[PDB]
Coordinates of C-alpha atoms and ligand atoms in Angstrom, one line a residue:
Chain Z
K6 CA -13.9 -17.2 17.3
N7 CA -14.7 -16.5 20.9
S8 CA -12.0 -13.8 20.6
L9 CA -12.6 -11.1 23.2
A10 CA -11.3 -8.8 20.5
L11 CA -14.6 -9.0 18.6
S12 CA -16.6 -8.1 21.7
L13 CA -14.7 -4.8 22.2
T14 CA -16.4 -1.5 21.7
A15 CA -14.5 1.3 19.8
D16 CA -13.5 3.0 23.1
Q17 CA -12.2 -0.3 24.6
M18 CA -10.2 -1.0 21.4
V19 CA -8.6 2.4 21.5
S20 CA -7.8 2.0 25.3
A21 CA -6.3 -1.4 24.6
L22 CA -4.2 0.0 21.7
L23 CA -3.1 3.1 23.7
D24 CA -2.0 0.9 26.6
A25 CA 0.0 -1.4 24.3
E26 CA 2.1 1.5 22.8
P27 CA 5.9 0.8 23.1
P28 CA 8.1 3.4 24.8
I29 CA 10.1 6.0 22.9
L30 CA 13.7 4.8 22.9
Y31 CA 16.9 6.9 22.8
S32 CA 19.7 6.4 20.4
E33 CA 22.8 5.0 22.1
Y34 CA 25.7 7.4 21.7
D35 CA 27.8 9.3 24.2
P36 CA 26.5 12.9 24.2
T37 CA 29.8 14.0 25.6
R38 CA 31.6 12.8 22.4
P39 CA 31.4 14.8 19.1
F40 CA 28.8 13.6 16.6
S41 CA 31.3 12.3 14.1
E42 CA 32.8 9.2 15.8
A43 CA 29.2 8.1 15.3
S44 CA 28.2 6.0 12.2
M45 CA 24.7 7.0 11.1
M46 CA 23.8 3.5 9.8
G47 CA 25.2 2.1 13.0
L48 CA 23.0 4.3 15.1
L49 CA 19.9 3.6 13.0
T50 CA 20.6 -0.2 12.9
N51 CA 21.1 -0.2 16.7
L52 CA 17.9 1.7 17.2
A53 CA 15.9 -0.6 15.0
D54 CA 17.3 -3.7 16.8
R55 CA 16.1 -2.3 20.2
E56 CA 12.7 -1.2 18.7
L57 CA 12.0 -4.7 17.4
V58 CA 11.9 -6.3 20.9
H59 CA 9.3 -3.8 22.0
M60 CA 7.4 -4.3 18.8
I61 CA 6.9 -8.0 19.6
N62 CA 5.5 -7.0 23.1
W63 CA 3.2 -4.5 21.5
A64 CA 2.0 -7.0 18.8
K65 CA 1.1 -9.5 21.5
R66 CA -1.2 -6.8 23.1
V67 CA -3.0 -6.0 19.8
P68 CA -6.6 -7.4 20.3
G69 CA -7.0 -10.5 18.2
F70 CA -3.3 -11.1 17.5
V71 CA -2.7 -13.7 20.2
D72 CA -5.7 -15.7 18.9
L73 CA -3.6 -16.6 15.9
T74 CA -1.1 -19.4 15.7
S75 CA 2.6 -18.6 16.3
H76 CA 3.4 -19.3 12.7
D77 CA 0.8 -16.7 11.5
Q78 CA 1.9 -14.1 14.1
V79 CA 5.5 -14.5 12.7
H80 CA 4.3 -14.2 9.1
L81 CA 2.5 -11.0 9.9
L82 CA 5.5 -9.5 11.8
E83 CA 8.0 -10.6 9.1
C84 CA 5.9 -8.7 6.5
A85 CA 5.0 -5.7 8.6
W86 CA 8.0 -4.9 10.8
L87 CA 9.6 -2.0 8.7
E88 CA 6.2 -0.5 7.9
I89 CA 5.5 -0.3 11.7
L90 CA 8.9 1.3 12.5
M91 CA 8.2 3.7 9.6
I92 CA 4.7 4.7 10.7
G93 CA 6.0 5.3 14.3
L94 CA 8.8 7.5 12.9
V95 CA 6.4 9.5 10.8
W96 CA 4.1 10.1 13.8
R97 CA 7.0 11.2 16.1
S98 CA 8.2 13.5 13.3
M99 CA 4.8 15.3 12.7
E100 CA 5.6 18.4 14.8
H101 CA 9.1 18.7 13.2
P102 CA 8.6 19.9 9.6
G103 CA 11.6 18.9 7.4
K104 CA 13.0 16.6 10.0
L105 CA 12.7 12.9 11.1
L106 CA 12.7 12.2 14.9
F107 CA 14.3 8.8 15.0
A108 CA 14.8 9.3 18.8
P109 CA 14.6 12.4 21.1
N110 CA 18.4 12.7 20.7
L111 CA 18.4 11.8 17.0
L112 CA 16.5 14.3 15.0
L113 CA 17.7 14.3 11.4
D114 CA 17.1 16.7 8.5
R115 CA 17.1 16.0 4.7
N116 CA 20.8 16.8 4.3
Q117 CA 21.7 14.2 7.0
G118 CA 19.8 11.7 4.9
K119 CA 22.6 12.1 2.3
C120 CA 24.8 10.2 4.7
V121 CA 24.4 6.8 3.0
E122 CA 23.7 6.5 -0.7
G123 CA 20.0 6.2 -1.6
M124 CA 18.7 7.0 1.9
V125 CA 17.6 10.5 0.9
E126 CA 14.9 9.0 -1.4
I127 CA 13.4 7.2 1.6
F128 CA 13.8 10.3 3.8
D129 CA 11.8 12.4 1.3
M130 CA 9.0 9.8 1.2
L131 CA 9.0 9.7 5.0
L132 CA 8.9 13.6 5.2
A133 CA 6.0 13.7 2.7
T134 CA 4.1 11.1 4.8
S135 CA 4.7 13.2 8.0
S136 CA 3.4 16.3 6.1
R137 CA 0.4 14.4 5.0
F138 CA -0.4 13.4 8.6
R139 CA 0.1 16.9 9.8
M140 CA -2.1 18.3 7.0
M141 CA -4.8 15.8 8.1
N142 CA -4.5 16.5 11.8
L143 CA -3.9 12.8 12.5
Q144 CA -4.9 12.0 16.1
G145 CA -3.0 9.6 18.4
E146 CA -6.2 7.4 18.5
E147 CA -6.3 7.2 14.7
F148 CA -2.5 6.5 14.7
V149 CA -2.7 3.4 16.9
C150 CA -5.6 2.0 14.8
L151 CA -3.6 2.5 11.6
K152 CA -0.5 0.8 13.1
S153 CA -2.6 -2.2 14.1
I154 CA -4.2 -2.4 10.6
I155 CA -0.6 -2.6 9.2
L156 CA 0.3 -5.5 11.5
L157 CA -2.8 -7.4 10.5
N158 CA -3.1 -6.4 6.8
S159 CA 0.4 -6.4 5.4
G160 CA 1.0 -10.2 5.5
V161 CA -2.6 -11.5 5.3
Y162 CA -2.7 -12.0 1.5
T163 CA 0.5 -14.1 1.5
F164 CA -0.4 -16.9 3.8
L165 CA 0.1 -20.2 1.9
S166 CA -3.4 -21.5 2.8
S167 CA -4.5 -25.1 2.0
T168 CA -5.9 -26.0 5.4
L169 CA -9.2 -25.3 7.2
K170 CA -7.1 -23.7 10.0
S171 CA -5.4 -21.2 7.6
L172 CA -8.8 -20.1 6.2
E173 CA -10.2 -19.6 9.8
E174 CA -7.0 -17.5 10.6
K175 CA -7.6 -15.4 7.5
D176 CA -11.3 -14.9 8.4
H177 CA -10.4 -13.9 11.9
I178 CA -7.9 -11.3 10.7
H179 CA -10.6 -9.8 8.4
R180 CA -13.1 -9.6 11.3
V181 CA -10.5 -7.8 13.5
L182 CA -9.8 -5.5 10.6
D183 CA -13.5 -4.8 10.4
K184 CA -13.5 -4.0 14.1
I185 CA -10.6 -1.5 13.6
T186 CA -12.6 0.1 10.8
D187 CA -15.6 0.5 13.1
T188 CA -13.3 1.9 15.7
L189 CA -11.9 4.5 13.3
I190 CA -15.4 5.5 12.1
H191 CA -16.5 5.7 15.7
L192 CA -13.7 8.1 16.6
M193 CA -14.6 10.4 13.7
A194 CA -18.4 10.4 14.5
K195 CA -17.6 11.4 18.0
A196 CA -15.3 14.2 16.8
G197 CA -18.4 15.4 15.0
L198 CA -17.5 14.6 11.4
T199 CA -20.5 14.0 9.0
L200 CA -21.1 10.6 7.5
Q201 CA -19.6 11.7 4.2
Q202 CA -16.5 13.2 6.0
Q203 CA -16.1 10.0 8.0
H204 CA -15.9 7.8 5.0
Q205 CA -13.7 10.2 3.1
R206 CA -11.3 10.4 6.1
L207 CA -11.2 6.6 6.4
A208 CA -10.3 6.4 2.8
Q209 CA -7.6 9.1 3.0
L210 CA -6.0 7.2 6.0
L211 CA -6.1 3.8 4.4
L212 CA -4.6 5.2 1.1
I213 CA -1.6 6.4 3.0
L214 CA -0.9 2.8 4.0
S215 CA -0.2 2.1 0.3
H216 CA 2.6 4.7 0.4
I217 CA 3.9 3.2 3.7
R218 CA 4.1 -0.2 1.9
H219 CA 6.0 1.5 -0.9
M220 CA 8.5 3.0 1.5
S221 CA 8.9 -0.3 3.3
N222 CA 9.6 -2.1 0.0
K223 CA 12.2 0.5 -1.1
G224 CA 13.8 0.4 2.3
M225 CA 14.0 -3.4 2.3
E226 CA 15.6 -3.4 -1.2
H227 CA 18.4 -1.0 -0.1
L228 CA 18.9 -3.2 3.0
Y229 CA 19.1 -6.4 1.0
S230 CA 21.6 -4.8 -1.3
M231 CA 24.0 -4.7 1.7
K232 CA 26.6 -7.4 2.5
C233 CA 25.6 -7.1 6.2
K234 CA 22.1 -7.7 7.5
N235 CA 22.3 -7.3 11.3
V236 CA 18.6 -7.0 12.4
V237 CA 16.2 -7.7 9.5
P238 CA 14.2 -10.6 11.0
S239 CA 14.1 -14.0 9.4
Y240 CA 11.0 -16.1 10.0
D241 CA 13.1 -18.3 12.4
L242 CA 14.4 -15.3 14.3
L243 CA 10.9 -13.9 14.7
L244 CA 9.6 -17.3 15.8
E245 CA 12.4 -17.6 18.3
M246 CA 11.7 -14.1 19.7
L247 CA 7.9 -14.9 19.8
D248 CA 8.8 -18.2 21.7
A249 CA 11.4 -16.4 23.9
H250 CA 8.8 -13.8 24.8
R251 CA 6.7 -16.8 26.1
Chain V
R3 CA -6.3 27.3 -0.3
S4 CA -7.4 27.8 -4.0
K5 CA -9.7 25.1 -5.5
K6 CA -9.1 24.1 -9.2
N7 CA -12.0 24.6 -11.7
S8 CA -13.0 21.0 -12.7
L9 CA -16.1 19.6 -14.2
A10 CA -15.0 16.3 -12.5
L11 CA -16.1 17.8 -9.1
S12 CA -19.6 18.6 -10.4
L13 CA -20.3 15.0 -11.4
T14 CA -22.7 13.0 -9.3
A15 CA -22.0 9.4 -8.2
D16 CA -23.9 8.0 -11.2
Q17 CA -22.2 10.2 -13.7
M18 CA -18.8 9.3 -12.2
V19 CA -19.5 5.6 -12.6
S20 CA -20.8 6.1 -16.2
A21 CA -17.7 8.2 -17.1
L22 CA -15.4 5.5 -15.6
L23 CA -17.2 2.6 -17.3
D24 CA -17.1 4.5 -20.6
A25 CA -13.3 5.1 -20.3
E26 CA -12.5 1.4 -19.9
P27 CA -9.7 0.2 -22.3
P28 CA -10.3 -2.7 -24.6
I29 CA -9.2 -6.3 -23.9
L30 CA -6.2 -6.9 -26.1
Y31 CA -4.9 -10.1 -27.5
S32 CA -1.4 -11.4 -27.1
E33 CA 0.8 -11.8 -30.2
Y34 CA -1.2 -14.3 -32.2
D35 CA -0.1 -17.9 -32.4
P36 CA 3.4 -18.0 -30.9
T37 CA 5.5 -21.1 -30.5
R38 CA 3.9 -23.0 -27.7
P39 CA 5.2 -24.4 -25.4
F40 CA 6.9 -21.3 -24.2
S41 CA 10.6 -20.8 -23.3
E42 CA 11.5 -18.3 -20.6
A43 CA 12.6 -15.8 -23.3
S44 CA 9.5 -16.3 -25.4
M45 CA 7.1 -16.0 -22.5
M46 CA 8.8 -12.7 -21.4
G47 CA 8.6 -11.5 -25.0
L48 CA 4.9 -12.1 -25.1
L49 CA 4.3 -10.4 -21.7
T50 CA 6.6 -7.4 -22.6
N51 CA 4.8 -7.0 -26.0
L52 CA 1.4 -7.1 -24.3
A53 CA 2.4 -4.5 -21.7
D54 CA 3.7 -2.2 -24.5
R55 CA 0.4 -2.4 -26.3
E56 CA -1.7 -2.0 -23.1
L57 CA 0.2 1.1 -22.2
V58 CA -1.1 3.2 -25.1
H59 CA -4.7 2.3 -24.2
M60 CA -3.9 3.1 -20.5
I61 CA -3.0 6.7 -21.4
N62 CA -6.3 7.1 -23.3
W63 CA -8.1 5.7 -20.3
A64 CA -6.2 8.0 -17.9
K65 CA -7.1 11.1 -20.0
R66 CA -10.8 10.1 -19.6
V67 CA -10.6 9.7 -15.8
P68 CA -12.5 12.8 -14.5
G69 CA -10.0 15.3 -13.0
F70 CA -6.9 13.8 -14.7
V71 CA -6.8 16.2 -17.6
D72 CA -7.0 19.2 -15.2
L73 CA -3.5 18.4 -14.1
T74 CA -0.4 19.6 -15.9
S75 CA 1.3 17.1 -18.3
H76 CA 4.2 16.8 -15.9
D77 CA 1.9 15.7 -13.0
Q78 CA 0.0 13.3 -15.3
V79 CA 3.3 11.7 -16.2
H80 CA 4.4 11.5 -12.6
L81 CA 1.1 9.7 -11.7
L82 CA 1.5 7.3 -14.6
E83 CA 5.2 6.5 -13.9
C84 CA 4.2 5.6 -10.3
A85 CA 1.0 3.7 -11.1
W86 CA 1.5 2.0 -14.5
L87 CA 2.3 -1.6 -13.3
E88 CA -0.3 -1.5 -10.5
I89 CA -2.9 -0.6 -13.1
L90 CA -1.8 -3.4 -15.4
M91 CA -1.9 -5.7 -12.4
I92 CA -5.4 -4.7 -11.1
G93 CA -6.7 -5.1 -14.7
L94 CA -5.2 -8.6 -14.8
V95 CA -6.6 -9.6 -11.5
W96 CA -10.1 -8.5 -12.5
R97 CA -10.0 -10.3 -15.8
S98 CA -8.8 -13.4 -14.0
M99 CA -11.6 -13.4 -11.4
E100 CA -13.8 -16.0 -13.0
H101 CA -10.8 -18.3 -13.8
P102 CA -9.7 -19.8 -10.4
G103 CA -6.0 -20.8 -10.4
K104 CA -5.3 -19.0 -13.7
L105 CA -4.2 -15.5 -14.9
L106 CA -6.0 -14.2 -18.0
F107 CA -3.3 -12.0 -19.5
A108 CA -5.3 -12.0 -22.8
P109 CA -8.1 -14.2 -24.1
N110 CA -5.4 -16.2 -26.0
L111 CA -3.0 -16.2 -23.0
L112 CA -4.5 -17.8 -20.0
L113 CA -1.7 -19.1 -17.7
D114 CA -1.8 -21.3 -14.6
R115 CA 0.7 -21.4 -11.7
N116 CA 3.0 -24.0 -13.2
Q117 CA 3.4 -21.8 -16.3
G118 CA 4.6 -19.1 -14.0
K119 CA 7.6 -21.4 -13.3
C120 CA 8.8 -20.9 -16.9
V121 CA 10.6 -17.7 -15.9
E122 CA 12.9 -17.6 -12.9
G123 CA 11.2 -16.0 -9.9
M124 CA 7.9 -15.2 -11.6
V125 CA 5.8 -17.9 -9.8
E126 CA 6.1 -15.8 -6.6
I127 CA 4.4 -12.9 -8.5
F128 CA 1.9 -15.3 -10.0
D129 CA 0.9 -16.5 -6.6
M130 CA 0.4 -13.0 -5.2
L131 CA -1.8 -12.2 -8.3
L132 CA -3.8 -15.4 -7.9
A133 CA -4.4 -14.6 -4.2
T134 CA -5.6 -11.1 -5.1
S135 CA -8.0 -12.6 -7.7
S136 CA -9.3 -15.0 -5.1
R137 CA -9.8 -12.2 -2.7
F138 CA -11.8 -10.2 -5.2
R139 CA -13.9 -13.3 -6.0
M140 CA -14.5 -14.0 -2.3
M141 CA -15.6 -10.4 -1.9
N142 CA -17.9 -10.5 -5.0
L143 CA -16.1 -7.4 -6.4
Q144 CA -18.4 -5.6 -8.9
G145 CA -17.2 -4.0 -12.1
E146 CA -18.3 -0.5 -10.9
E147 CA -16.2 -1.0 -7.7
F148 CA -13.3 -2.2 -9.9
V149 CA -13.2 1.0 -12.1
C150 CA -13.3 3.2 -9.0
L151 CA -10.4 1.2 -7.5
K152 CA -8.4 1.5 -10.7
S153 CA -8.9 5.2 -10.8
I154 CA -7.9 5.6 -7.1
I155 CA -4.6 3.8 -8.0
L156 CA -3.9 6.3 -10.8
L157 CA -4.5 9.3 -8.6
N158 CA -3.1 8.0 -5.3
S159 CA 0.1 6.1 -6.1
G160 CA 2.2 9.1 -7.1
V161 CA 0.4 11.8 -5.1
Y162 CA 2.7 11.8 -2.1
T163 CA 5.9 12.1 -4.2
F164 CA 5.3 15.4 -6.0
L165 CA 8.3 17.6 -4.9
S166 CA 6.1 20.6 -3.9
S167 CA 7.5 24.0 -2.8
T168 CA 4.9 26.3 -4.5
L169 CA 1.4 27.3 -3.8
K170 CA 0.5 25.9 -7.2
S171 CA 1.9 22.4 -6.3
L172 CA -0.2 22.4 -3.1
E173 CA -3.4 23.3 -5.2
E174 CA -2.5 20.5 -7.6
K175 CA -2.3 18.1 -4.6
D176 CA -5.6 19.4 -3.1
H177 CA -7.3 18.8 -6.5
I178 CA -6.1 15.2 -6.5
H179 CA -7.4 14.7 -3.0
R180 CA -10.8 16.2 -3.8
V181 CA -11.1 13.9 -6.8
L182 CA -10.1 10.9 -4.6
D183 CA -12.8 12.1 -2.2
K184 CA -15.3 12.1 -5.1
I185 CA -14.4 8.5 -6.0
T186 CA -14.8 7.5 -2.3
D187 CA -18.3 8.9 -2.3
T188 CA -19.0 7.1 -5.5
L189 CA -17.9 3.8 -4.0
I190 CA -20.0 4.3 -0.9
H191 CA -23.0 5.3 -3.2
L192 CA -22.7 2.0 -5.1
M193 CA -22.6 0.0 -1.9
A194 CA -25.7 1.9 -0.4
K195 CA -27.6 1.2 -3.6
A196 CA -26.6 -2.5 -3.4
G197 CA -28.4 -2.4 0.0
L198 CA -25.4 -2.6 2.3
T199 CA -25.9 -1.2 5.8
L200 CA -23.8 1.8 6.9
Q201 CA -21.4 -0.5 8.9
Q202 CA -21.1 -2.9 5.9
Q203 CA -20.4 0.0 3.6
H204 CA -17.5 1.3 5.7
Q205 CA -16.1 -2.2 6.2
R206 CA -16.2 -3.0 2.5
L207 CA -14.6 0.3 1.6
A208 CA -11.7 -0.5 4.0
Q209 CA -11.3 -4.1 2.7
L210 CA -11.1 -2.7 -0.9
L211 CA -8.6 0.1 0.0
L212 CA -6.4 -2.3 2.0
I213 CA -6.0 -4.6 -1.1
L214 CA -4.4 -1.6 -2.8
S215 CA -1.5 -2.0 -0.4
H216 CA -1.0 -5.5 -1.6
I217 CA -1.2 -4.3 -5.2
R218 CA 1.6 -1.8 -4.5
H219 CA 3.6 -4.6 -3.0
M220 CA 3.1 -6.8 -6.1
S221 CA 4.1 -3.8 -8.4
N222 CA 7.3 -3.3 -6.3
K223 CA 8.2 -7.0 -6.4
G224 CA 7.4 -7.1 -10.1
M225 CA 9.7 -4.2 -10.8
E226 CA 12.5 -5.6 -8.7
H227 CA 12.5 -9.0 -10.6
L228 CA 12.4 -7.1 -13.9
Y229 CA 15.4 -5.0 -13.0
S230 CA 17.2 -8.1 -11.9
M231 CA 16.6 -9.7 -15.3
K232 CA 17.3 -6.6 -17.5
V236 CA 11.6 -0.8 -17.2
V237 CA 9.3 2.1 -16.1
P238 CA 8.1 3.6 -19.4
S239 CA 10.2 6.7 -19.9
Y240 CA 9.0 10.2 -19.1
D241 CA 9.3 11.2 -22.7
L242 CA 7.4 8.2 -24.0
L243 CA 4.6 8.9 -21.5
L244 CA 4.6 12.6 -22.5
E245 CA 4.5 11.8 -26.2
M246 CA 1.5 9.4 -25.7
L247 CA -0.2 12.0 -23.6
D248 CA 0.4 14.6 -26.3
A249 CA -0.5 12.2 -29.2
Ligands
LIG1 C1 14.5 4.9 7.2 C2 15.5 4.7 8.2 C3 16.1 3.3 8.2 C4 16.0 2.4 9.3 C5 16.6 1.2 9.4 C6 16.0 -0.1 9.5 C7 16.9 -1.2 9.6 C8 18.3 -1.0 9.4 C9 19.3 -2.1 9.4 C10 18.9 -3.5 9.4 C11 19.9 -4.6 9.3 O1 21.2 -4.4 9.2 O2 19.5 -5.7 9.4 C12 18.8 0.2 9.3 C13 18.0 1.3 9.3 C14 15.3 2.8 10.5 C15 16.0 2.6 11.7 C16 15.3 2.9 12.9 C17 14.0 3.3 12.9 N1 13.2 3.6 13.9 N2 12.1 4.0 13.4 C18 12.1 3.8 12.0 C19 13.4 3.4 11.7 C20 14.0 3.2 10.5 C21 16.8 2.9 7.0 C22 18.0 3.5 6.7 C23 18.7 3.1 5.5 C24 18.1 2.2 4.6 F1 18.8 1.7 3.4 C25 16.9 1.6 5.0 C26 16.2 2.0 6.1 CL1 14.7 1.3 6.4
LIG2 C1 3.4 -10.7 -13.9 C2 3.5 -10.6 -15.4 C3 4.6 -9.6 -15.9 C4 4.2 -8.4 -16.7 C5 5.2 -7.5 -17.3 C6 5.0 -6.2 -17.3 C7 6.0 -5.3 -17.9 C8 7.1 -5.9 -18.4 C9 8.0 -5.0 -19.0 C10 9.4 -5.4 -19.4 C11 10.2 -4.4 -20.2 O1 9.8 -3.2 -20.5 O2 11.4 -4.7 -20.5 C12 7.3 -7.2 -18.5 C13 6.3 -8.0 -17.9 C14 2.9 -8.2 -17.2 C15 2.7 -8.1 -18.6 C16 1.4 -7.8 -19.1 C17 0.4 -7.6 -18.3 N1 -0.9 -7.3 -18.5 N2 -1.5 -7.3 -17.3 C18 -0.6 -7.5 -16.3 C19 0.6 -7.7 -16.9 C20 1.8 -7.9 -16.4 C21 5.8 -9.7 -15.3 C22 6.7 -10.8 -15.6 C23 7.9 -10.9 -15.0 C24 8.4 -10.0 -14.0 F1 9.6 -10.2 -13.5 C25 7.6 -9.0 -13.7 C26 6.3 -8.8 -14.3 CL1 5.5 -7.5 -13.7
LIG3 CL1 16.8 0.9 24.9

C-alpha cells in the first residue's frame, strides 16, 4: 500500500490522532428543570447517538482507515463502536475517582449506576479501568494510540476473507497496527523509560484492551436484552452513515 | 507499596519458560467411541464432558504457574472463574494450528466447520476459533510463546475485577502485575533469542497481546450461547479442586 499512514513518524502519527479527536459533548437536559423528569437511559442513549456521528468523522481521520474499502470500515466500526465510547468515558473519568464523566454536565457515581438493572456491574468495570489508567499515569498521546488500536483490532479477526482483496485489507490493518505500536514505544522512549519498561508498559496497555472488550460485550448483551434498540448500529446503518459522510 | 515475597519474581526468562513448559496439562481424549454421526445433544455431551475433565488438569496447571500459589485461594478462584473458557479456547486453538480448517478438541475429536453446524449457533464460534488458529499459524506462534500467553490470560482476565478496598487487595493486584511484567520480559527474551530486531520484538508482542482481546470475545460469545441453551464452574467446585 502506498498508504501515507505507513510513511508517518511517531510524532506525525500522534499529531494526526490528536487533531482527529472528537469534541466533548454535553448531555441534553434543561438545567433549569429538576433532575428527575430526566430518564437516565434516555440521557445515555441520546448522548451515545450524538457521539456516534462524531466517531465516524474521527474514524475517517485515523491514518490508514480511509485506505480500506467502505465495507471493511463499516465492519471495523460495527465491532468497535461501544469499546470506543467506553475508552473515551474512562479517559474523561480519570481525574474523578469513583465517578463516570459521561458529559461535563453528567457526572455519575456508583449509586447512580443502580438506576437501571445490571448497569452497576458495567459501572464497576468502567471505574476499575479508570483507576487502572490513573494508576498508570496514562497520557493523552498514549490514549489516542489505544483508541485507534481498538478501531483497527476489534473487528480484524472476523472479516469473512476468501478474496485477494480481503487478505490485502487484513495485511494493511496489521501494518498500521505495527505503526501504532512503534508510535507507542517511541513516546515511552522519549519520556525516558528503559527498554524493559517500554515493553512492559506496552503490554500493560494492550492487556487493558482485553478488559475493554469484556465490558463492551457485557454492555452489548444488556442492550440486546431490551425490546428497544434506538442507536446500536447495524451494518447497513453504519454503511449509510459512512456514505452520507461522503 | 508492599511487595509480596515470591520465588516467581526471582526466576530468569529461561527458568520461567521451563517452569511453564513443565506445568503444561496433558492432551485428553474425548469419551471413547461415541455414536457417530453426532446429534446436537450428543455433540454437546461430548464437549461438556471434555471440558469437565480438562478443568481438573487446568487447576493443576494454574497451581504451577509461577506467582499463582502466592495468592489467596479466593483470588485464585476469581482468576479461574474469569479465565477458564479463554484458557480452554487458547489450548484448542494451539492444538488445531497444524490442522487447517479443523478444530482438534481431542486426538479422537477433530471437527471441521460443517460439524459446527450440528448445534445451533456453534458454527459462529467455530469460525472465530478457526480464524484464531489461522492467525497463530500465519504468525508461526512458538510453543514457548503459547505457554506465556496462556499464563497471561490466567493472570490478566480477572485482575481488574477484584473488589479492592484494602491495602492488602492493592498488594495482591501489584503482585499480579509484577508477574505479568515477568512474563512480558520472558516473551521479549524468547523473541530476542530467536533473532528478532527490537522493532520486530515490540511489534510481535503487540500482535500476540491483541489476539487476547479476540479470545476474550470468543469466551464471551461462547458463554452467551451456553446460557441461551441451558455454566461457569462454581466457586465451591474451583475451591475444592484447588484444595484437593
Ligand atoms: C456504560 C453506559 C452505557 C452507554 C450506552 C450506550 C448505548 C445505549 C443505548 C443504545 C440503543 O438503544 O440502541 C445506552 C447507553 C453509554 C452511553 C453514552 C456513552 N458515552 N460514552 C460512553 C457511553 C456509554 C450503557 C448503559 C446501559 C447499558 F445496559 C449498556 C450501556 Cl453500554
Ligand atoms: C466451542 C466448543 C464448546 C466448549 C464447551 C465448553 C464448556 C461447556 C460447558 C457446558 C456446561 O457446563 O453445561 C460446553 C462446551 C468446549 C469444550 C471443550 C473444549 N476443549 N477446548 C475448548 C473447548 C471448548 C462450546 C460449544 C457450544 C457453545 F455454545 C459454547 C462452547 Cl464454549
Ligand atoms: Cl451535540
